[PDB]
């Protein structure tokens, strides 16, 4: 079950046997991140590091005290020494609390990993804050998505994704403080 | 093409069925005990008894009985009641 002892350090030593000796080793994405998963530490009691990302932005990388994540089973919350978790998220609201103050991003879906060292790594695609969403045109397209269901089995899923996104978006503009 | 060769030999039993039937019969007749509803008596009783009195009523139930428990013979009326 351990046929290939791979890794970044192993690739350097074997690549000096097949490539020319002029070329130095290519870099690897492990050489650019300092935070690991199994590396012990990185909790520091109350506030744990939350890396809330998008493809186009780094929306948070400082530490928070709790993260309300919109998992596909339901909304769960993460405290500091949470269990290791690979959580696929629904379209829902990621709530980043620091204490008394909390910032509420509505995300489109996309995973969230809690690593064994207590590092939370939320990984979504479009993460809009609810301040820049308007509650008018959400049901203007949801009423259209509640009407147009043909026998296209590819649009079977794409309309299902259209309905469940706006429906969670309907319910998460109503309860704002 | 060989279909008419297999129609020639007709039915045939499995290839040792006479040892199964002679083994099941030899277990049902070599019981070593009287024959299920009968009792061995002496020769002096067998020669002295009518064949209507050797018969028991329990061993001759009625072939399609109009009342459950009807028997065909009645046996010895000389009960030891």
């Amino acid at each position: 079950e351990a046929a290939a002892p791979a890794g970044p350090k192993e690739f350097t030593e074997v690549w000096n046997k097949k490539a020319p000796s002029t070329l130095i080793v290519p870099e690897f994405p492990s050489n650019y991140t300092a935070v690991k998963a199994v590396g012990e530490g990185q909790v520091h009691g109350d506030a744990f590091p939350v890396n809330f990302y998008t493809p186009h932005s780094i929306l948070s990388q400082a530490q928070k005290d709790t993260v309300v994540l919109p998992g596909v089973d339901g909304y769960f919350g993460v405290k500091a020494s949470h269990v290791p978790t690979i959580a696929q998220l629904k379209p829902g609201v990621v709530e980043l609390h620091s204490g008394a103050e909390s910032e509420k991003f509505f995300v489109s879906g996309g995973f969230a990993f809690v690593h064994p060292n207590g590092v939370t790594d939320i990984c979504v695609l479009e993460a809009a804050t609810l301040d820049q969403v308007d509650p008018a045109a959400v049901k203007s397209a949801l009423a259209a998505a509640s009407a147009a269901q043909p026998t296209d089995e590819f649009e079977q899923a794409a309309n299902r994704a259209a309905i469940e996104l706006y429906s969670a978006l309907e319910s998460a503009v109503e309860a704002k403080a | 093409s060989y279909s008419a060769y297999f129609a020639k030999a007709g039915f045939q039993f499995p290839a040792g069925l006479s040892a199964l039937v002679a083994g099941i019969v030899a277990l049902n007749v070599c019981t070593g005990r009287p024959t299920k509803g009968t009792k061995e008596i002496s020769n002096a009783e067998y020669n002295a008894t009518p064949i209507g009195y050797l018969q028991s009523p329990d061993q001759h139930p009625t072939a399609f009985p109009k009342v459950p428990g009807m028997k065909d013979v009645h046996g010895s009326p000389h009960h030891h009641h």
């Binding site: - | 060989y2 060769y5 297999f6 030999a9």
Partner: protein, 217 residues
Amino acid sequence: SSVRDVKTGSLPTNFLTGVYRFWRSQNPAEKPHDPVNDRLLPAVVDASDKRASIGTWATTFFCTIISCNLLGLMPFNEAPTSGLGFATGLGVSVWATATILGLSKTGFKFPFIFVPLETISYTFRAVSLGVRLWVNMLAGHTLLHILTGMALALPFSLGFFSMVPATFGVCCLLSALVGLEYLVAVLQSGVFSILSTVYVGEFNHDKFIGPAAKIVK
């Protein structure tokens, strides 16, 4: 003295090939560490000489019980495995075959307060293998006798070919119990001989002899 001629690819030859190869697959041979070549071939042949013929025994018990269980579903016939000595006499005989196999793995000597509790749960396998076959063939046929007596109470009392929605719903309940009995006839011959491969296959383990001397590289 002259054997009969068999057509190749007959349906009973194809069924019994698939049946035998099924029960043989339940206790597969274990792969040696060595590659199997002419060096390892007497060790593989001797590994097969020391394995029990559970592929043959389990299809003996499959074919003798599914033939007996399905006799109970033929008209004018009862299942022989609905008898207590027949059905439990096959269950004890599988259990004794497993034990005689496991006792011979040594020199026929029989194996603190734990081992009377491993033995009890092991000696109950004897009666449980046969009584499960007996009670299934008895309890299905007995329920069919009771419900045929109930379903005969309605046309006996009411009219012959009259008040037919009362007897239709119970003649279809009687018909669906004979249909379940065809499923229990096939399942209990399968469960008896799946379990015969499990019980006999517990003691189906010997040492691979293998090469004691090698010429490496």
